[model samples]
Target: RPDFCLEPPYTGPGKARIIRYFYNAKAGLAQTFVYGGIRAKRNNFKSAEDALRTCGGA
Candidate 1:
């Protein structure tokens, strides 16, 4: 898989911002970071699509 990133617009709830979806080369996994709002969170996925699906994106 390729490495990539995404920053979806803050159109939905929680005022989320700078959401990221990328591959972790060292760990050999996809990762995501949900930033902004009252708290931030991180997650790992099998692919970028999986991360986006769970977080937020097309």
Candidate 2:
């Protein structure tokens, strides 16, 4: 899957979804990739996921 599916579990849809799914599946997940650490360099994933989740890719 070199090409992005432009879909879920990529960045995930909601922080809540991530929080919920991660908590739900955290035990099975060997690793979790949390993108961006600081505000200035923040990945904007929060905003992006929310958009994709709610708006169907807007």
Candidate 3:
């Protein structure tokens, strides 16, 4: 995990969905990556649960 510390873990649970949060320069906003593929660029990440919400979990 240290190798990719900047990124989120590949394994996730329910809504967590292996989400990662970082600033999106192109969009000029904070964004999150879900399942290592789904990019919910419309919003930002304030907490770990934020990504969980994106995944439709708690």
Candidate 4:
């Protein structure tokens, strides 16, 4: 699981859950998506730390 998924904000119903991370080898970046009951949201980041920050993780 992504570090962001471990954050307290992600808990409970309808909260965002980091489902997966997709890395683009050529661009050297990563994309992640979250599932929050009704919808799935996407986020792009340059590194794991960025991803964590974007998701408000510790």
User: Local distance difference test, per candidate?
Assistant: 0.44, 0.29, 0.42, 0.43
How do the candidates rank by lDDT, highest first? Answer: 1, 4, 3, 2
Model 1: per-residue lDDT, tens digit, 1-58?
Answer: 2223232222234575655454444554455555445432234343577655554423
Pairs with steric clashes in candidate 4: none
Better candidate by TM-score, 2 or 4: 4
Stretches > 4 Å off in candidate 3? 1-17, 35-58
Task: Report the error of model 2 at residue 43, Å.
Answer: 19
- For model 1, the superposed segments whose C-alpha errors exceed 4 Å read 1-16, 34-47, 50-58
Give one digit per residue, the lDDT tens place, for model 3 in 1-58.
1122234333233355555564443443345556434434333354545433453222
- Counted clashes in each candidate structure: 0, 0, 0, 0
Candidate 4: deviation at residue 4, Å? 13
RMSD of 4: 9.3
Task: Give the alpha carbon lDDT tens digit for every residue of 1-58 in model 4.
Answer: 3433433222225665645543333344455444454432334433566654555433
Q: How many backbone clashes does candidate 3 have?
A: 0
Candidate 3 collision pairs: none
Top lDDT prediction, candidate number: 1
lDDT of 3: 0.42
Of candidates 3 and 2, the better by TM-score: 3
lDDT of 2 at 33: 44
RMSD values, in order shown = 9.1, 10.6, 11.1, 9.3
